Amino acid sequence: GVSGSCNIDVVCPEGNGHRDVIRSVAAYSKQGTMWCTGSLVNNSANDKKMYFLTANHCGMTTAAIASSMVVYWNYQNSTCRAPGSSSSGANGDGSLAQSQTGAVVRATNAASDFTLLELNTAANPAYNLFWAGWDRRDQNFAGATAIHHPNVAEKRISHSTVATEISGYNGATGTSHLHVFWQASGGVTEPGSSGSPIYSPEKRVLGQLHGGPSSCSATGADRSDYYGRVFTSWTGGGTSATRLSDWLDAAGTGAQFIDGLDST
Amino acid sequence: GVSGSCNIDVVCPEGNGHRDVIRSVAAYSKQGTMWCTGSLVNNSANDKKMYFLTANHCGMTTAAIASSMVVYWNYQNSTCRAPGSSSSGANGDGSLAQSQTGAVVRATNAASDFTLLELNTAANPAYNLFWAGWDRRDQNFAGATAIHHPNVAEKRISHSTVATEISGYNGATGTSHLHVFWQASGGVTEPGSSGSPIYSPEKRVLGQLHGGPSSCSATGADRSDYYGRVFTSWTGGGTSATRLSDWLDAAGTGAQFIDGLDSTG
Ligand SMILES: *C[C@@](*)(O)[C@H](CCCCN)NS(=O)(=O)c1ccc(C)cc1
Ligand SMILES: *C[C@@](*)(O)[C@H](CCCCN)NS(=O)(=O)c1ccc(C)cc1
Ligand SMILES: [Ca+2]
Ligand SMILES: [Ca+2]
Ligand SMILES: [Cl-]
Ligand SMILES: [Cl-]
């Protein structure tokens, strides 16, 4: 696929500290059309349930739509194309051969733009998946990392090396979103990246991409994005079908944050 | 309620040409909290069905939430506060006494950020409602008018006097949205305005507010917004639960645009 040249192929050295959670992120189609990003999340039972977090606005919100979605793992460029280069802006060489079809909707809620699906098919060990940890604490972090499929193209990584802020969407009054500021010439996010995770420095999901002003041409404060917070989605709309808590902590261990779980 | 001072009270002279469709627009609450804007739309049978168009992102998409929503009619400042004035930015004197409760979801689709509800309670003639026309044709217009409840506060009007553009949301590649550019010192839209209609110069709904960069301090290209298009929502997700066509033209007359219907007719 094709995305903005300023983006950074996950295989680049910028991915050296994220070789586990890179394997949590997938691209997916909706009714046959490549559509959005999501990612695999661990739960407090460490049981490999195929909980797959994405964005409500992507519309994977009905049993019918979830039933026909196709999830594509390990879709990324084989080599590190120099960020900013014509090559990086060109069609990549990623494979879409490792896929699975079908899911059910466990929960969804508009306010933090989240959807939690459970994929029908158990993880194929051959795909070498990773179930990422999460952190639902009410706090900002000193930096963060996005792993995402911009334009639903090959997987990219984008780093933020400044503090997050808590706000509503687009900086409105609120606490539903984490506002993440990208580096002046670093990777950003694009339509198609929605639903992609933002990770804390300890590699725990804090939220998933809703949207924002960033693009490769964006400058200043516009080079930033908003993620619907796990903190907010945890309690969500106050029912099991509108929040994360019943799924990510079904046993009720009271975990405020957990680590990831590897296929191995 | 309180909203940005650059906004324009509907009772101002700026509303002189919209005294009908002003009466289509309402504010509503979600699980008790003032939440978003919607508006009443006519259908090809001219039968006063309480079809109420709003935004999918407002989350009025489940039976439970639709059942407990409260819709507030005729919530506006009694006098024209000068746009840009401290008065305009202050709490208004609108009333929330004329309301009704409950609806069902007829259709919703994320791509054009639309939800079509049908309110449970038939129109109260005393409320003096108007069911706006609509226009599903695939085209831009030379200008447009928004009527909305910014911050779910008193009703305001915002005029665009330049051409609309067709794009995806936030100017992305696509045709799902109408991009509307506001006047340098004119009214804008704000969170809470979502779901509010954009009207063609002929006062027909073309779409409902999704979002965008505008605010009272926004400048140039940022002083603009994106509306999910009726044209797009008409066909929607290809089923009656994901599109407008089955509801707004149940009879299958083939209407490409219709005019409004007043309470007095
Ligand atoms: C849906 C997501 O892929 C995008 C991500 C944009 C990232 C830009 N830096 N979100 S969105 O805001 O563009 C959006 C929201 C709602 C709908 C219906 C479409 C697109
Ligand atoms: C939901 C709407 O009230 C707002 C309107 C903002 C208009 C700014 N000029 N839309 S939004 O884009 O800010 C938005 C979208 C999704 C969610 C969950 C919240 C807010
Ligand atoms: Ca508010
Ligand atoms: Ca039908
Ligand atoms: Cl695309
Ligand atoms: Cl949205």
Task: Please provide a written account of the structure.
The structure is a homodimer. The first copy, chain A, contains three helices and 19 strands. Chain A has two domains: 1-24 and 134-231, Trypsin-like serine proteases (Thrombin, subunit H); 25-131 and 233-263, Beta Barrel (Thrombin, subunit H). The longest helix of chain A is centred in the last third of the chain and has 6 residues, at 230-235. Chain A is globular and about 50 Å long. Chain A is 6% helix and 32% strand. In chain A, strands 1, 10, 11, 12, 13, 14, 15, 16, 17 and 18 form a ten-stranded mixed beta sheet that branches. The first copy, chain A, has a seven-stranded antiparallel beta sheet with strand order 6-5-2-3-4-8-7. Chain A has a two-stranded antiparallel ribbon with strand order 9-19. Chain A has 264 residues and is mainly β. In chain A, a hairpin with a 7-residue loop joins strand 11 and strand 12. The first copy, chain A, has helices at 63-67, 230-235, 245-248, and strands at residues 8-9, 25-30, 33-40, 51-55, 70-73, 99-101, 103-109, 114-119, 130-131, 133-135, 144-148, 156-160, 165-167, 177-181, 197-199, 204-211, 224-229, 257-258, 261-262. One calcium ion binds next to loops of chain B. Chain A: Belongs to the peptidase S1 family. Chain A: It catalyses: Preferential cleavage: Lys-|-Xaa, including Lys-|-Pro. Chain A: One of its GO terms (molecular function) is serine-type peptidase activity. Chain A: Disulfide bonds join 6-216, 12-80, 36-58. Chain A: The active site is at 57 (charge relay system), 113 (charge relay system), 194 (charge relay system).
